[PDB]
Amino acid sequence: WAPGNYPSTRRSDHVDTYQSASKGEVPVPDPYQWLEESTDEVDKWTTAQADLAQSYLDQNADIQKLAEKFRASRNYAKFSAPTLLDDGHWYWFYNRGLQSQSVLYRSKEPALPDFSKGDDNVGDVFFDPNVLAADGSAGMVLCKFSPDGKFFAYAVSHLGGDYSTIYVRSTSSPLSQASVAQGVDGRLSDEVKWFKFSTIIWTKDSKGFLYQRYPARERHEGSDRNAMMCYHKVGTTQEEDIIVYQDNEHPEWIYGADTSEDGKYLYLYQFKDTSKKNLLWVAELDEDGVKSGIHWRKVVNEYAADYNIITNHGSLVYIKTNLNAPQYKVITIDLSKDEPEIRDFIPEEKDAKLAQVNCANEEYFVAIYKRNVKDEIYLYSKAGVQLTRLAPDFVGAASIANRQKQTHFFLTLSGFNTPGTIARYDFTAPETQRFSILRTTKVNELDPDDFESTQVWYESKDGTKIPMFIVRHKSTKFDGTAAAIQYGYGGFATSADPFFSPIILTFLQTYGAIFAVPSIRGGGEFGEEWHKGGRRETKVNTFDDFIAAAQFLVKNKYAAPGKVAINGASNGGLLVMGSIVRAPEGTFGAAVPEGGVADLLKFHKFTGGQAWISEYGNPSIPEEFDYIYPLSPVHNVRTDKVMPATLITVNIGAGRVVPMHSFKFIATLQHNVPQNPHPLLIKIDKSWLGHGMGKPTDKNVKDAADKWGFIARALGLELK
Amino acid sequence: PWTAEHVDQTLASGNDIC
């Protein structure tokens, strides 16, 4: 590769006209409009680009070395929390280390295993999703056991497919290499097609489950509208499924459900966009079970807040909500009254987000609070008294795993240097012996104790103080010499939580680099106001926050000048692409946007773009075009600014941002600064991933070595 | 999906399966 050696990219005469509130009609040339299409010409162009990128990476002999180190760092057994089913047996996922899909195991004995003996010594395979297809083209993307433990419902996606299909099997019928060689699959004939974008919710009689589906679509027919919440009865075909709810007048809205443990209530959630606002309707179930013509009580019938059911006791329903409470709280709504009475059960904390609440042991509550972007776990009594903090020395991210009716619960704990701890709380144990560690994840080659994470605060352009995690190998100094990889997402109220990555830690140890995770506005770290601080008309703050983080790393000698690289995916790819356009020349030394939005004027004209109007605004509204257009990366590339080395990565598939965003952005970079001194490249994986499907592990390792090696070489880092 | 493609998800994959 050399500057100016990019594939020829045709420029059309296409112009789109938009209406600006401040400037009236604005004509916007779109010379790469044709990259919106799927054609021979586009295939040759993406092939030329991917060949150019691979040619450049081929010049870098260190990538293969990183692949070896990265594969080894991933090669350690991994496992989930176990779940006790009503058959008395415990089920958990187990991965031998490098398997592409983890395998669902079942305890040999009706007792909690001593997992120190080894998963294969205490459990047998129950469901191995690797055998769904002999060539790995099918993945299990969601599953749910029935409450009585007799059935296992599982959603399957295929390469090339745009929906998932739900299947059902008896829990006494394993799916394994042995079972498929020795006989038929063993599942029921049920085949529930057209499923996507909800969970699977069993009724508590275990007769069936609720799931969202879309209209059947022929190959050359006509978009994803007219979602329906449906009910599937086990042992029937889908033509007998009941439509529980649809709304022809609002064909864009989607649906969720929940069922109360006591069998009394069916709950319906409705969502009109990606804001955290939903309707909440409540139906009473009887002997008649789930039926068409269900009567809904429209308890929450305006879009104003997030409501998610926790549990109920009789007609008193406990709900996690952010109604008038942007850090969230628990309310009760008493349905015994004509006008429901609404009360705070666990009040909002001004400065800590209530992130999750589960009912445990029938009448207790386990709450996770996120304070300064670090999770804290507490146990509450039925009277709302905070009893104890669990795992008080844990620093990182926590989740709860339990079933409300049982006498125990688990916590799953991980963080930058905590690979994966599963703790157990046993209410039947003596009062000082209730909390224990069930399993700790043991990693390979790496020693997590060799790494430190800390949290520092910097100031954004408008004065706002923003926290940022910094992770380093403990021999790395903050003396103005390290490289930094700065990661972000920056949207949709998603929190940039601690997480464990053996590949990142291996990179940090290999090169003496640091990893930086700033909690930029648009995320949900500090509740819904933090999200509102970076969305629609304030979305510019997300970019200012991310740019100020990189400037702070260099100014305060965490990292060397010009040695901050940035990386992010989906919304985080938009973050990366807009950041390199907006920041002063030299702010970044490398950039890897993964599958981002980049045409912020046309994003809502494609597939899943409409739902994002709540996050970015609507380009077709003149007042909103005026704040979108200055931020749109495709429309703000200059000719006078040196760009960092950039490797754009694109994965094709269901539910992913359409790739024309990345295509237009890289075509526009190579048109505007063809002689850039640093390579501006794009790598496309043309396999069509189905919904929820990942790539095989070996491809993931190869892609990681390419990405991190590209960054290392761009920043001048050498293998010691 | 905060870290959905970048890290193995086995640890939390059992939290809500019944």
Author numbering:
A (entry chain A): 6 to 227, 230 to 727
B (entry chain C): 8 to 25
Excerpt from the paper describing this PDB structure:
GmPOPB is the macrocyclase responsible for macrocyclization of amatoxins, eight amino-acid ribosomal peptides with the core sequence IWGIGC(N/D)P. Amatoxins are cyclic peptides further modified by a characteristic sulfoxide cross-link between tryptophan and a cysteine, and hydroxylation (the extent of which vary). GmPOPB is an unusual enzyme catalyzing, depending on substrate length, proteolysis, or macrocyclization using the same catalytic machinery. The domain containing the putative catalytic residues (Ser577, Asp661, His698) comprises residues 1–81 and 450–728, and the other domain is a seven bladed β-propeller, comprising residues 82–449.
In order to obtain co-complexes, we mutated each residue of the presumed catalytic triad (mutants S577A, D661A, and H698A) to ensure inactive protein. In all 35mer and 25mer complexes, the enzyme adopts the same “closed” conformation in which the lid (the propeller domain) sits on top of the catalytic domain. The oxyanion-stabilizing Tyr496 is in close proximity to the core proline (P8) in the 25mer structure (D661A mutant), while Tyr496 hydrogen bonds with P18 in the 35mer complex. Substrate residues I11–P18 (the core peptide is not seen in the 25mer, apart from weak density from P8 in the D661A–25mer complex) form a twisted loop, which makes contacts with the protein and within itself; atoms that will ultimately form the macrocycle are 7.6 Å apart. To confirm the importance of the putative catalytic triad for GmPOPB, the mutants S577A, D661A, and H698A were evaluated for activity, and were inactive with both 25mer and 35mer substrates, using 5 μM GmPOPB and monitoring the reaction progress after 24 h. The recognition tail adopts an identical distorted 310 helix conformation inserted into the middle of the β-propeller domain in both the 25mer and 35mer complexes.
